[PDB]
Amino acid sequence: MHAKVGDYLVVKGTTTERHDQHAEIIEVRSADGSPPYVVRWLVNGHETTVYPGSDAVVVTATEHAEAEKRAAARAGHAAT
């Protein structure tokens, strides 16, 4: 996994069915791709530092709106 700033983080379901744990990566605490990350819930509304899980993927704006609402409730429910 390799992270990038200005992009969105996803966890779970690399097979592409259920993509959870969503947010915007504005601060990458890795030079390549290793947790933790400083993440913003944009479509939710808060900043924090979270620990994602396995099957972490990088998405863009559209994958962020709906999916980050639900999947941030998934991600930032704990490990904060």
Side-chain angles (χ1 to χ4, degrees):
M1 188 279 181
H2 187 93
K4 185 177 298 176
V5 57
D7 280 292
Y8 296 97
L9 185 151
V10 170
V11 174
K12 296 169 73 286
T14 48
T15 319
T16 307
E17 193 286 277
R18 59 191 74 170
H19 280 296
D20 290 280
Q21 306 190 212
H22 267 78
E24 179 174 75
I25 314 175
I26 74 294
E27 286 293 309
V28 185
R29 262 290 75 246
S30 183
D32 170 65
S34 53
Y37 295 100
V38 180
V39 116
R40 289 185 183 167
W41 323 116
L42 314 190
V43 279
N44 297 272
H46 202 67
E47 298 71 37
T48 189
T49 306
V50 295
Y51 301 91
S54 178
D55 293 76
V57 192
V58 182
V59 280
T60 48
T62 31
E63 329 304 289
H64 130 90
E66 35 185 278
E68 182 190 297
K69 295 179 181 180
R70 311 188 308 202
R74 302 279 250 175
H77 209 119
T80 50

